[PDB]
Design a protein around this nucleic acid. Structure first.
Ligand code: MG
Ligand code: MG
Ligand code: MG
Ligand code: MG
Ligand code: MG
Ligand code: MG
Ligand code: MG
Ligand code: MG
Ligand code: MG
Ligand code: MG
Ligand code: MG
Ligand code: MG
Ligand code: MG
Ligand code: MG
Ligand code: MG
Ligand code: MG
Ligand code: MG
Ligand code: MG
Ligand code: ZN
Lengths: 139, 130, 37, 141, 135, 185
RNA sequence: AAGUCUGGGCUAAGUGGUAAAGGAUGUGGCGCCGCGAAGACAGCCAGGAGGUUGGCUUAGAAGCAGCCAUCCUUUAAAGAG
């Protein structure tokens, strides 16, 4: 009979085992902890990878409730520029490239997560996040 | 002396693009509940004018120096100005009073406001959408 | 207490005091405690 | 460390420290300088330590210039012998320095970085030494 | 170096000579040795020491303390999984640093953890260890 | 960028008396004139620290004249790192030989790669009309990598303004950067 | 033996009446920039947030081992800390 909690997790895709942080902060739910292996890898089994964020709430008769966001800035851009990884040293070696209008459509994937609700504002976020990794933007 | 000048111009600009500017004591609100009850008055109060919060010191040299009915509500305390006319508001003061008189212990608390160009009132401004 | 001819602020909370003819350094961290000596 | 490749003569008489630097008084290359506040034969292993300090600080790095070079061979009789029986054996080299001399200069480095290096370098030397920075007065020389 | 076995080498034989008379089986043994005894001497020899593959099982209260000890024992850590919940930490530490481990482990884990440990491989002891040993 | 400084006339006063009372002994001359002058130390210093030997200073003499000059030399006392005396060249409509600030434009490929730009000359010698002192001269040093340099022979040169030293003379270089790795040896 | 002599200033250690690198909110006097009634400095009341675990690097380095970069966003503000 443990308290009403507001839990916030970050686990990736696949590894859906009931070990921390899926254990101590999640015992307070009486959670169907393994109902996430199946209620998560059902929106991410056509995809496969991608960390998909999650918030897990419990009430007073011991059941759990979770809702997810959309795959990372760094993630979306990696499989549009022919890449598995980033660029080791951001600066002197670009290991991919992306046009002004492929970042916008990536910026259109992340539109309902952000601070602004725009496209020119949003795509410069994608643009700054390409400098963060060292992939030149095809301008 | 200083950047304090290029903010008198700022507030002059956004004031000289109106006639109905309100003001709210945007205190305790978090960051999660801040970028809410602000996009709130950005999808209810046109353009991107929820609050333009700036130093009361200067927003009395603002209302003072356009004469703009010397908005003497009491620009003491946390004071944030709800451009309701750099928007398109009317009973959109209800856009305010719902987010605040619920999502806190007193949320978007109202203080001074002046519609058309005439000084509104206290609760009579806070009841001007209820 | 550290006792040396070089008494210095060691970290950003370190405080330098002059007590009864003596320069001391006093601080939240107790390794930082110096006396000039 | 430093010393002459070759010399016309191996030991020299001791001479004297009267006076301000003969020359060498203004900054010529770097942006910061270390000036001697006093007379002293600075010895090479000294100079060397000071260098090593600054490279160790910078890590990598900028540029250190050295404006004094140790060319006075220092004599010393062997321990426990007596006066007489001739002049002693050269043991190392030193550079005669007088106040106002700039000894070391630094370039290509943050202003914080420079001062701190120079601070350290001074500590390795047997004399007072104020840090200076390049001015109008320097380039008027 | 200290007269321990030589391992991990490629022995290429090529040139040579013989005698229908003087030469012998014994006479070639000595040849091989003399050859090898100079091979492994003229080519930057080096002292390898053993390295153990270690599993420590700890209530995860104790994780960092343990990993901390682990690195501090000249070890190199490999990863961490859960078990009887409980946690497990895998590592390569040099055996030279596993003597009487059970007791620090028990101190560092309130007498609640345990470990197994196995030889995995050998490798170059630190240039600052090696040359102490050459005594 | 066209400086002024008060300037008064000394005759028999001691340089020591003067230096003591905050003043700076000095002389002003040219092929038509020669005159012993003093300026306030602190006032000259404020001007001179911007002007240097680069930009005109204008001398307001008690008589009311407004001599336009160039600082030619400045003697420092070597023991105290300080100015003892200033030489004031009184300019004239003829061209004249003087020193031009070089402003190094751009970041080299040699810097940004680990190393260091050693501005050998921060200014340069120039024959020129007083009526057109180019208070600046920009040099692009973005193409320099470590081990590369740049001589007068480059150097754009406004008009006019011809050089005044061998173009054979080198003016900047990029040299490698103090490495603690380089140490132990 | 002769002034508890006169006027201005400093010093608080009996310094004066034993010494150096160096170290210090000791005390006085200068000088230079800086912020400040368009409200500074001190305390104290809010906020201090997104894209995002930035890319890379170990098994993990999620602002704060460390190697690059240090943009962008809502913003009064808020660093890839
Ligand atoms: Mg010390
Ligand atoms: Mg304290
Ligand atoms: Mg002699
Ligand atoms: Mg001589
Ligand atoms: Mg000596
Ligand atoms: Mg005797
Ligand atoms: Mg001798
Ligand atoms: Mg001998
Ligand atoms: Mg010293
Ligand atoms: Mg100086
Ligand atoms: Mg000369
Ligand atoms: Mg001066
Ligand atoms: Mg008296
Ligand atoms: Mg008196
Ligand atoms: Mg004492
Ligand atoms: Mg005494
Ligand atoms: Mg005494
Ligand atoms: Mg003092
Ligand atoms: Zn401290």
């Amino acid at each position: 009979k443990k308290v009403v909690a507001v839990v916030k997790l970050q686990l990736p895709a696949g590894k859906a085992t009931p070990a921390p942080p899926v254990g101590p902060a999640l015992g307070q739910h009486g959670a169907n902890i393994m109902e996430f292996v199946k209620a998560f890898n059902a929106a991410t089994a056509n995809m496969g990878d991608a960390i998909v964020p999650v918030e897990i709430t419990i009430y007073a008769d011991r059941s759990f409730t979770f809702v997810t966001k959309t795959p990372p800035a760094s993630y979306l851009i990696r499989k549009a520029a022919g890449l598995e990884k980033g660029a080791h040293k951001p600066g002197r070696e670009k290991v991919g490239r992306i046009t002004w209008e492929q970042v916008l459509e990536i910026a259109k994937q992340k539109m309902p997560d952000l601070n602004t609700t725009d496209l020119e504002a949003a795509a410069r976020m994608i643009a700054g996040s390409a400098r963060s990794m060292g992939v030149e933007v095809v301008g | 002396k200083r950047n304090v000048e290029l903010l008198a111009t700022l507030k002059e600009n956004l004031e000289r693009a109106q006639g109905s500017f309100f003001l709210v004591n945007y205190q305790g609100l978090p960051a999660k509940e801040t970028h809410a009850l602000r996009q709130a008055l950005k999808q209810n109060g046109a353009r991107l004018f929820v609050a333009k919060n700036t130093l009361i010191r200067l927003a009395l040299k603002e209302l003072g120096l356009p004469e703009l009915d010397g908005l003497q509500g009491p620009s003491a305390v946390v004071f944030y100005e709800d451009p309701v006319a750099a928007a398109k508001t009317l009973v959109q003061f209800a856009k305010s009073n719902p987010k605040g008189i619920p999502q806190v212990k007193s949320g978007l608390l109202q203080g001074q406001i002046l519609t058309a160009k005439d000084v509104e009132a206290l609760a009579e401004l806070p009841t001007m959408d209820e | 207490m550290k006792v040396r001819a070089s008494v210095k602020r060691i970290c950003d909370k370190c405080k330098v005091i002059r007590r009864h003819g003596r320069v001391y350094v006093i601080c939240e961290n107790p390794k930082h405690k110096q006396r000039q000596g | 460390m430093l010393m002459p490749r070759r010399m016309k003569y191996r030991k020299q008489q001791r001479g004297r420290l009267k006076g301000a630097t003969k020359g060498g008084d203004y900054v010529a290359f770097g942006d910061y300088g270390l000036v001697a506040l006093e007379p002293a034969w600075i010895t090479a292993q000294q100079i060397e330590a000071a260098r090593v300090a600054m490279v160790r600080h910078f890590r990598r790095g900028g540029k250190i210039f050295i404006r004094i070079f140790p060319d006075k061979p220092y004599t010393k009789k062997p321990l426990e012998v007596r006066m007489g029986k001739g002049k002693g054996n050269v043991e190392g080299y030193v550079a005669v320095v007088k106040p106002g001399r700039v000894m070391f200069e630094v370039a290509g480095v943050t202003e914080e970085q420079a001062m701190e290096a120079l601070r350290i370098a001074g500590h390795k030397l047997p004399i007072k030494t104020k840090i200076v920075r390049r001015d109008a007065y320097d380039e008027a020389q | 170096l200290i007269g321990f076995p030589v391992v991990d080498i490629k022995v290429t034989l090529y040139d040579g000579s013989y005698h229908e008379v003087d030469s012998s089986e014994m006479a070639f043994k000595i040849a091989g040795s003399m050859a090898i005894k100079e091979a492994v001497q003229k080519g930057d020899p080096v002292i390898l020491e053993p390295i153990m593959r270690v599993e420590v099982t700890t209530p995860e209260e104790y994780m960092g303390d343990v990993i901390g000890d682990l690195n501090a024992r000249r070890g190199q850590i490999l990863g961490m999984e859960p078990r009887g919940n409980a946690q497990v930490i895998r590592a390569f530490v040099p055996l030279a640093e596993m003597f009487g481990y059970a007791t620090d482990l028990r101190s560092k884990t309130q007498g609640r953890g345990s470990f197994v440990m196995f030889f995995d491989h050998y490798q170059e002891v630190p240039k600052q260890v090696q040359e102490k040993l050459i005594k | 960028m066209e400086y002024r400084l008060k300037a008064y006339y000394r005759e028999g006063e001691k340089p020591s008396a003067l230096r003591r009372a905050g003043k700076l002994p000095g002389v002003m001359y040219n092929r038509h004139l020669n005159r012993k002058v003093y300026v306030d130390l602190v006032e000259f210093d404020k001007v001179f620290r911007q002007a240097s030997i680069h930009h005109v200073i204008v001398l307001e003499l008690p008589d009311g004249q407004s001599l336009p000059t160039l600082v030619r030399q400045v003697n420092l006392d070597k023991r105290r790192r300080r100015p003892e005396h200033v030489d004031f060249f009184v300019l004239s409509d003829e061209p004249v030989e003087m020193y031009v600030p070089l402003r190094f434009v751009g970041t080299p490929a040699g810097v940004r790669a680990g190393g260091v730009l050693q501005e050998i000359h921060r200014d340069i010698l120039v024959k020129v009309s007083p009526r057109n002192i180019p208070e600046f001269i920009e040099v692009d040093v973005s193409g320099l990598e470590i081990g590369d340099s740049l001589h007068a022979s480059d150097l754009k040169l406004p008009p006019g303004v011809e050089l005044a030293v061998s173009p054979e003379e080198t003016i900047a270089a990029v040299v490698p950067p103090e490495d603690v790795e380089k140490l132990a040896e």
